[PDB]
Amino acid sequence: EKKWWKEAVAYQIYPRSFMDSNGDGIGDIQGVISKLDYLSDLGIDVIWICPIYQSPNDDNGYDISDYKDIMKDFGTMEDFDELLDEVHHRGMKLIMDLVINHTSDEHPWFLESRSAKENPYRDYYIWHEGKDGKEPNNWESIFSGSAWEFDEKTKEYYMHVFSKKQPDLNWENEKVRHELYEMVNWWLDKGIDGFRVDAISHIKKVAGFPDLPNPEKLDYVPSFEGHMNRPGIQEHLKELKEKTFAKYDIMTVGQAPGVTSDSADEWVAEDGGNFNMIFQFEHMGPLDLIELKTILTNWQNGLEKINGWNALYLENHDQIRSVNKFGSTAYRVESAKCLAALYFLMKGTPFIYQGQELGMTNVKFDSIDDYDDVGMINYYRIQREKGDSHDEIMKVIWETGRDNSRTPMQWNTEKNAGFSTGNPWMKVNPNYVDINVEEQKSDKNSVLNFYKQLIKIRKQHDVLVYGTYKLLAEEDSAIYAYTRTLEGKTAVVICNMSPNNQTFEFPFTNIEVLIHNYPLDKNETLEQCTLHPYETRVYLLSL
Ligand SMILES: OC[C@H]1O[C@H](O[C@H]2[C@H](O)[C@@H](O)[C@@H](O[C@H]3[C@H](O)[C@@H](O)[C@@H](O)O[C@@H]3CO)O[C@@H]2CO)[C@H](O)[C@@H](O)[C@@H]1O
Ligand SMILES: [Ca+2]
Ligand SMILES: [Ca+2]
Numbered sequence: 001e002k003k004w005w006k007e008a009v010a011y012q013i014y015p016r017s018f019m020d021s022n023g024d025g026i027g028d029i030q031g032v033i034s035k036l037d038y039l040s041d042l043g044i045d046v047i048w049i050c051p052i053y054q055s056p057n058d059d060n061g062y063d064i065s066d067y068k069d070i071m072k073d074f075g076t077m078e079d080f081d082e083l084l085d086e087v088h089h090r091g092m093k094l095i096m097d098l099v100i101n102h103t104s105d106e107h108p109w110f111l112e113s114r115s116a117k118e119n120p121y122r123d124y125y126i127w128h129e130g131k132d133g134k135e136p137n138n139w140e141s142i143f144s145g146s147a148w149e150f151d152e153k154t155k156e157y158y159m160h161v162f163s164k165k166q167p168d169l170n171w172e173n174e175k176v177r178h179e180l181y182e183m184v185n186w187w188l189d190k191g192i193d194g195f196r197v198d199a200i201s202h203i204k205k206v207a208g209f210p211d212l213p214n215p216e217k218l219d220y221v222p223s224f225e226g227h228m229n230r231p232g233i234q235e236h237l238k239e240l241k242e243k244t245f246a247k248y249d250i251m252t253v254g255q256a257p258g259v260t261s262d263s264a265d266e267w268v269a270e271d272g273g274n275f276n277m278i279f280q281f282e283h284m285g286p287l288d289l290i291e292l293k294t295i296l297t298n299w300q301n302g303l304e305k306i307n308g309w310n311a312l313y314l315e316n317h318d319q320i321r322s323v324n325k326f327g328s329t330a331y332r333v334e335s336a337k338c339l340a341a342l343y344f345l346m347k348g349t350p351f352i353y354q355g356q357e358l359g360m361t362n363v364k365f366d367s368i369d370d371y372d373d374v375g376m377i378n379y380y381r382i383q384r385e386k387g388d389s390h391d392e393i394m395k396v397i398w399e400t401g402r403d404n405s406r407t408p409m410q411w412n413t414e415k416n417a418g419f420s421t422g423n424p425w426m427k428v429n430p431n432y433v434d435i436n437v438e439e440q441k442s443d444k445n446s447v448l449n450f451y452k453q454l455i456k457i458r459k460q461h462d463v464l465v466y467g468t469y470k471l472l473a474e475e476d477s478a479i480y481a482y483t484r485t486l487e488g489k490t491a492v493v494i495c496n497m498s499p500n501n502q503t504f505e506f507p508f509t510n511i512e513v514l515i516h517n518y519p520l521d522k523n524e525t526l527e528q529c530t531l532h533p534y535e536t537r538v539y540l541l542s543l
Contacts, residue, residue, distance in 0.1 A: 005251035008045035020420035043455035093193035126159035139223035194250030204233035229258035261302035268308035310348030508541035
């Protein structure tokens with residue numbers, strides 16, 4: 001059945017890096033308000049804003065110390081209320097980031113929990129006595145080091161999947177769950193339009209927290225088999241839905257690593273799924289194009305079978321830039337557009353991450369002091385102590401680190417690319433002199449205007465929202481081609497995902513080119529497409 005959230009195009013803002021309105025180098029809510037014309041003109045329907053709640057910022061808002069107050073760096077609740085009012089008067093919607101696997105260690109519940117074994121908040125978090133004079137088990141944090149941190153006062157360890165300042169909440173405690181549901185409903189009562197639900201596949205821990213294998217005798221071992229998508233999680237997520245989301249006309253997208261296309265039914269089926277869609281991570285870990293076709297096609301066909309719906313994306317605040325990960329910096333403009341048509345025109349709701357629509361790319365800062373990510377700074381400290389060299393650590397940070405997606409948004413060629421009049425919290429990528437909103441708005445051939453046109457064709461042609469996906473030319477190691485079919489219309493999406501010229505055989509009573517990123521050759525025959533590197537074309541056929 002048709003739904004507003006299926007038809008939408010979403011845009012993800014990382015507010016610390018979107019727009020600084022007051023010169024302190026930190027993006028803020030009045031900065032977002034000042035750029036709403038940009039998003040409305042792009043054609044965005046839904047804005048997902050990353051966390052904006054009170055936080056010490058050990059993990060840039062994902063360590064929350066008050067769920068009901070706004071981060072001071074970003075503004076006040078009055079600024080939030082102005083943002084939501086202006087978004088809604090522009091006919092757009094706003095979803096917030098719901099972070100309920102863990103809190104800050106400065107949240108009042110944790111300050112109480114850590115104070116005594118008998119404090120009434122003790123069991124709001126995950127506490128355990130050590131084993132053999134060390135931690136309760138051998139589990140590694142996702143941000144490196146142990147997943148357990150010792151409290152000298154009470155002589156027990158608390159669990160943190162993420163940073164030492166992000167103690168995990170104990171979802172086995174009914175009192176925790178009840179306080180969380182009241183908080184979620186307090187936000188929904190304000191008239192927000194839903195949530196992106198952070199780290200939500202991590203809320204169930206294997207009981208007893210058993211050690212995992214360690215044949216290499218590492219200090220700690222990766223611990224996803226102890227806490228990622230574990231049996232028992234669905235009971236908690238079904239109750240979360242019944243007590244909160246199901247009471248409101250909203251959209252939910254869960255961040256759900258560890259879910260595969262054949263295990264997705266309980267997450268996203270129309271009949272009984274806990275969210276409307278999830279971010280799945282199987283495609284985010286020459287490029288093996290056939291492997292990518294396999295993953296994305298498994299999710300297109302798999303969710304069509306269960307009446308689920310895909311969240312389509314190639315970028316977010318936790319990944320490197322998609323030109324580097326999936327395209328080519330030697331063909332930056334052409335590959336940015338080719339990737340855009342490829343991912344955006346599958347069946348699902350597309351998400352655009354800030355700067356993806358400009359073709360922004362990874363940065364390379366010379367010094368570890370120029371980086372911020374708690375995960376990579378802890379990785380550096382831990383690996384340096386083990387004897388890894390500075391150079392080998394920097395290669396990991398430069399090639400894989402999510403700070404590549406957190407540099408200031410590139411609005412123009414003024415100081416700091418127009419993101420701030422002060423000293424940005426993270427330096428601007430030097431390539432803003434070439435890559436910026438102002439230059440792209442005036443260039444018909446820009447990446448930005450290619451995204452504007454994708455959004456327009458998807459809105460104008462129902463086949464691009466609701467049409468059935470089918471993979472074409474599966475064994476072609478260069479060409480990713482697929483169709484969308486609805487009634488008497490078929491759209492053909494052709495993407496030459498290679499840095500070479502290629503030829504491709506086109507797979508009706510009328511044919512139209514809907515978008516293309518190279519000039520068309522009038523002598524070219526439809527039958528024998530001669531594609532340039534990273535050339536994409538979308539055709540609409542009337543059957
Ligand atoms: O609030 C903490 C943290 O949560 C969100 O992202 C984290 C994911 O929840 C978490 O699973 C982990 O992702 C890893 C995948 O599990 C793994 O399969 C593969 O993709 O590598 C990832 C290593 O991180 O980590 C991410 C954080 O990187 C949230 O969106 C983050 O901003 C936040 O820091
Ligand atoms: Ca600011
Ligand atoms: Ca040609």
